Design a protein around this ligand. Structure first.
Ligand code: VYY
Ligand code: ZN
Length: 257
C-alpha cells in the first residue's frame, strides 16, 4: 500500500487519497519573512506532568510512543487552541542523511528529523471522531538537528532494537515527554493536515521555532529500523517524510516577534 518508496511514495498518494491535492495539506515551508506575528496568540500550555506512556510500536512507516488518553493526563492548550487537546502519541520523521528528514522546512531549510506530538480535541470524545473535524487535532512539531545528544531521547533510542520491524511493539511505560522539548515554546501555527495517508485536514499545526539537538549516534539508531516486517526483505526505515505542500490560501502566524 502507501509508503515512501519510489513506487508508493508521496507523489503516488493522491491516487488512493485525493485529498492529497487539497486546500490545507501539510507539511509546508515556513517562510519566516512572510509569517506574521499575531499578538492575540496566547502562550502555549504544555501540561505533561501526569503523562502515562504505555507502549512503543513500529507501524511500518514510523514508530509511535503511545499514551493513555482516556483521561486528561497530558494536555496541550492555549496558543491558537480553543479547548483541551489530549496527547495520544508521538513519533518522528527522519532522513537517511543529516541534511534532510524534517517534514516542515524553515525558509526551505530541512532539519535532520522532526518530532510530532499528536493531540486530539476532547470535545469530540475520541481520536477517531476528532480526525473527522477541522479542529480535531493539534500536532506539536519540533525540529531535530544533529549535534549534542538529547538525554531525554535516549530511553526511546535504546528500545528501538526491540521493535526493529513492522508490527513489533514493546512496553514503554513511565516515559517523560517534556524531556523532548526545547527551552523555548515560541512557535509558528497554521491549519493543515495529517502528513501521511489518510491526509485528513484536521490539524492545527504548532511548530516550535527552537530545534532540539540529538547526537549523530541517536539518529543513526533511528536509521536502523525497518519498514518491513520480520522475515521480509530488509528495507531501512529512512526518509519517512512528506515534502512541503503548497500553502495555498493560508497564513502562518508567529507567536513571537
Ligand atoms: C493508547 C494509544 C494511544 C495512541 C494510539 N495511536 C494512534 O491513534 N496513532 C496515529 C494516528 S493516525 O491517524 O492513524 N495517523 C497519523 C497521526 C499523525 C500524523 S502526523 N504525521 O501528521 O503527525 C499522521 C498520521 C494507540 C493507542
Ligand atoms: Zn508525523
Amino acid at each position: 500500500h502507501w509508503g515512501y518508496g519510489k513506487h508508493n511514495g508521496p507523489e503516488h498518494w493522491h491516487k488512493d487519497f485525493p485529498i492529497a491535492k487539497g486546500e490545507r495539506q501539510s507539511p509546508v515551508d515556513i517562510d519566516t519573512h512572510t509569517a506574521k506575528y499575531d499578538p492575540s496568540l496566547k502562550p502555549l500550555s504544555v501540561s505533561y506532568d501526569q503523562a502515562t506512556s504505555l507502549r512503543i510500536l513500529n507501524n511500518g512507516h514510523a514508530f509511535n510512543v503511545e499514551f493513555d488518553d482516556s483521561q486528561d493526563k497530558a494536555v496541550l492548550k492555549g496558543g491558537p487552541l480553543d479547548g483541551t487537546y489530549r496527547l495520544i502519541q508521538f513519533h518522528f520523521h527522519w532522513g537517511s542523511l543529516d541534511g534532510q528528514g524534517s517534514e516542515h522546512t524553515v525558509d526551505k531549510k530541512k532539519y535532520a528529523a522532526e518530532l510530532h506530538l499528536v493531540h486530539w480535541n476532547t470535545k469530540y470524545g475520541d481520536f477517531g471522531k476528532a480526525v473527522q473535524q477541522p479542529d480535531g487535532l493539534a500536532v506539536l512539531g519540533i525540529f531535530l538537528k544533529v549535534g549534542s545528544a538529547k538525554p531525554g531521547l535516549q530511553k526511546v533510542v535504546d528500545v528501538l532494537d526491540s521493535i526493529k520491524t513492522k508490527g513489533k511493539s514493546a512496553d514503554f511505560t513511565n516515559f517523560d515527554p517534556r524531556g523532548l522539548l526545547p527551552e523555548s515554546l515560541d512557535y509558528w501555527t497554521y491549519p493543515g493536515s495529517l502528513t501521511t495517508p489518510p491526509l485528513l485536514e484536521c490539524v492545527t499545526w504548532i511548530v516550535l521555532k527552537e530545534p532540539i539537538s540529538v547526537s549523530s549516534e541517536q539518529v543513526l539508531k533511528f536509521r536502523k529500523l525497518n519498514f518491513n516486517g520480520e522475515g521480509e526483505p530488509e528495507e531501512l526505515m529512512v526518509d519517512n517524510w512528506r515534502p512541503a505542500q503548497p500553502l495555498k490560501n493560508r497564513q502562518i502566524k508567529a507567536s513571537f516577534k
